[PDB]
Design a protein around this nucleic acid. Structure first.
Ligand SMILES: [Zn+2]
Lengths: 63, 23, 49, 214, 97, 127
RNA sequence: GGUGAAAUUCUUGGAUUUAUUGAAGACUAACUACUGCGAAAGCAUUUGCCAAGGACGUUUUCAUUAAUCAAGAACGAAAGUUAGGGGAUCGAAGAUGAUCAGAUACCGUCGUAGUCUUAACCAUAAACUAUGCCGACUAGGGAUCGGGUGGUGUUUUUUUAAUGACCCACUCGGCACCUUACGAGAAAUCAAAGUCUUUGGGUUCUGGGGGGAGUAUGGUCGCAAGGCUGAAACUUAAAGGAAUU
């Protein structure tokens, strides 16, 4: 059951119809230097870890 | 009312008047 | 169709008409074939032949 | 219920013999079992190979040499020149606004009965110390350039046994012959052959194919 | 009235320009009138190139680009392309981005 | 040192093919597509389905023997969009990040030299 | 496949995808421009042939031969009509799937006629620069073509180069233009729409409130579709142009 923990390094405004989703940039704690863009739902500060069930797919804005 | 379809309507009833008058 | 029914399989009637299908079988006997022998189709086609 | 990759033998793709790397890759064929020999299926197999990979250098990166598997001699699968072409996005980078493209195409023969169609592209260079924002050539200058190119591409042929043409396409010498034969008319930057076709070939001659080894 | 000194067009000295199909609408529009813009991009996006290079053979990674001139009709362009219908003042400003 | 193939990423709109072939292109190694991996379409040429396709074909490519792959990214071509679909940038990178080796990336979109009449009409799609 | 989403659609007798070829008929992408030519319509692959044409140069020639033009003529997009080829793609009609309240439309898949071609017609387009032509005068930058000077600029090698071309600066003639503005216009605006109550260079065509109406009729031409010319009765106080809030 591989879940990947990744700390956020910068937050980038908010996507979605409303500001329900926040576009964030994460750095993988495991095997770091890998920076990926990702969507969240709830309130995000910096230094907060997110649990990815897929390290692969990138993130786009929710038009 | 479109000055094209107005014109087409006139040009149809003219042709159908030609075919009526050829009798 | 303009003959008497003796003379042709199209003859007779109080109107000139074939009466039955003019498309005749290939297996129709030598004497029965009058109209269109083994007609794959009939009628005037649209576009290209 | 098959997964036929079990019965698929790998063969030895050799690229004789003018290019440095005489070894390219490996092509798999359905195994030579009942009544269908491998040869039948692996004959006429056009494998494109990038001339960068085929000569190591990155100056040969905008070139693809088509190679057809032709011979077998006791399980020895060697290819031969089938066509040269430019990369689909170097060709498109050389094309640019405020220039003039010139396309010369000649349906030439060779010393051997090889009907080759050689193309060639040449763009107009705005000369150093120019305040005019484009390098547009005149129709007469382009007619004169096409003539020059056409008779050079035909002069470097009747010689050139396709093998000699291959060995004179690689080192970019037709390019820097046409350069000096056109500079008397127009600057003309980026002279390339860009493409060669084999429209028709002679009878096989396995001697002509096998003289490209050892 | 007459909106433009041009005609949202170039055709001055010519009788008829051979037309061009809009990239998305498919609408045929005379070439001179058609909103042309070169779409030059890296083959691989500006997020993938790290893992592309590290898992690629041939160090120095030439990374060839892609080139295609997008021809757009006027209505397809007004869908938030570089058009953003500007004031009767700023209509005349020819200078690109 | 590494056995080679061709990726042939036909990323159109409405679907993505990650059809890995032999060098010559005579032999198919694996032809998984975007729509195979999600049975509720709405999204066939999507980055997610393209990544899934790329992961499956790559895994198959590791089993069958080929180690590195040349990439031939392809749009519809013909008279249509002629721009690579949104699943093209997924299928490539996903080929690499699976563990396959990638190289000689070059776009083979069949551009017409002086086209035929494009589908639609004079006024085109009205919407 | 195709979509905002789908469904018709074809597919395991392996469709879609891949490759090696072959065929057919269109089409001339990128270069391609505030760029060229042409009476307008139009005209962008290559080479060859046949004629033509402006511009420039000209210490050539003729010597008013000219400008514009009722009647009268030639060319005239697309569609359309005849009859032969041709028919790939796309697509009026039609079939059909969606949407819809209905939607015989917009979207999807097919799809005859349709011309792309040869001969013969038709003769209209927002055929537009919605600006007649010939002529004179009134005020910055590029760029096409020709010519004149200059650079000890580049290339030029067969010894120095004879040059030639490309390029640079100044210069004109004509061209397609564009940027700023004293005059003009109801204004939008402009190289002519200026030289107009301080009203006259030549000349052809057209209009007189809105409808009815580009209709009826009569000729005329056309295979037909239609084209040219073209009214009135009656009706109505506005219709319209430009700019402002
Ligand atoms: Zn459009």
């Amino acid at each position: 059951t591989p879940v990947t923990l990744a700390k956020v390094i910068k937050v980038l405004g908010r996507t979605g119809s409303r500001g329900g989703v926040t576009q964030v940039r994460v750095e993988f704690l495991e095997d770091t230097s890998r920076t990926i863009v990702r969507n969240v739902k709830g309130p995000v500060r910096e230094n907060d870890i997110l649990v990815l069930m897929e390290s692969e797919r990138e993130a786009r804005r929710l038009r | 009312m479109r000055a094209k379809w107005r014109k087409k309507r006139t040009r149809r009833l003219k042709r159908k008047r030609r075919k009526v008058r050829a009798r | 169709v303009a003959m008497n029914p003796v003379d042709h399989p199209h003859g007779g009637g109080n109107h000139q008409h074939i009466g039955k299908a003019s498309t005749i079988s290939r297996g129709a006997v030598s004497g029965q074939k009058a109209g269109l022998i083994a007609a794959r189709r009939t009628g005037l086609l649209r576009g290209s032949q | 219920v098959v997964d036929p990759f079990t019965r698929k033998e790998w063969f030895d793709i050799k690229a004789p013999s003018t290019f440095e790397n005489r070894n390219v890759g490996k092509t798999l064929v359905n195994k030579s079992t009942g009544l269908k020999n491998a040869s039948d299926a692996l004959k006429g197999r056009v494998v494109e190979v990038c001339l960068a990979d085929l000569q190591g250098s990155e100056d040969h990166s905008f070139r693809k040499v088509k190679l057809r598997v032709d011979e077998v001699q006791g399980k020895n699968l060697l290819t031969n020149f089938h066509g040269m072409d430019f990369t689909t996005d170097k060709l498109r980078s050389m094309v640019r606004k405020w220039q003039t493209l010139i396309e010369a195409n000649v349906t030439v023969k060779t010393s051997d009965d090889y009907v080759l169609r050689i193309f060639a592209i040449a763009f107009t260079r705005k000369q150093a110390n120019q305040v005019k924002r484009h390098s547009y050539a005149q129709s007469s200058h382009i007619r004169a350039i096409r003539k020059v190119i056409s008779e050079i591409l035909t002069r470097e042929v009747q010689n050139s046994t396709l093998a000699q043409l291959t060995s004179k396409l690689i080192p970019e010498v037709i390019n820097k012959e046409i350069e000096n034969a056109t500079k008397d008319i127009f600057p003309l930057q980026n002279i390339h052959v860009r493409k060669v076709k084999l429209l028709k070939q002679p009878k096989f001659d396995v001697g002509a194919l096998m003289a490209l080894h050892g | 009235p007459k909106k433009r000194a041009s005609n949202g067009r170039n055709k001055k000295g010519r009788g008829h320009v051979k037309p061009v199909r809009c990239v998305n609408c498919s609408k045929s529009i005379p070439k001179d009138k058609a909103i042309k813009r070169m779409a030059i991009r890296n083959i691989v996006e500006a997020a993938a190139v790290r893992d592309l290079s590290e898992a690629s053979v041939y160090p120095e990674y030439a990374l060839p680009k892609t080139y295609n001139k997008l021809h757009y009709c006027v209505s397809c362009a007004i869908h938030a392309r570089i058009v953003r219908v500007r004031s009767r003042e700023d209509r005349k400003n020819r200078a690109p981005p | 040192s590494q056995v080679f193939g061709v990726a042939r990423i036909y990323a159109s709109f409405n679907d993505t093919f990650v059809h890995v072939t032999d060098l010559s292109g005579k032999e198919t190694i694996a032809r998984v597509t975007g729509g195979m991996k999600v049975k509720a379409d709405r999204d066939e040429s999507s980055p997610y389905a393209a990544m899934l396709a790329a992961q499956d074909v790559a895994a198959k490519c590791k089993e069958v023997g080929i180690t590195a792959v040349h990439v031939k990214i392809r749009a519809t071509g013909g008279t249509r969009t002629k721009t690579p679909g949104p699943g093209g940038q997924a299928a490539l990178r996903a080929l690499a990040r699976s563990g396959l080796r990638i190289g000689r990336i070059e776009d083979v979109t069949p551009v017409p030299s002086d086209s035929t009449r494009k589908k639609g009409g004079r006024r085109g799609r009205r919407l």
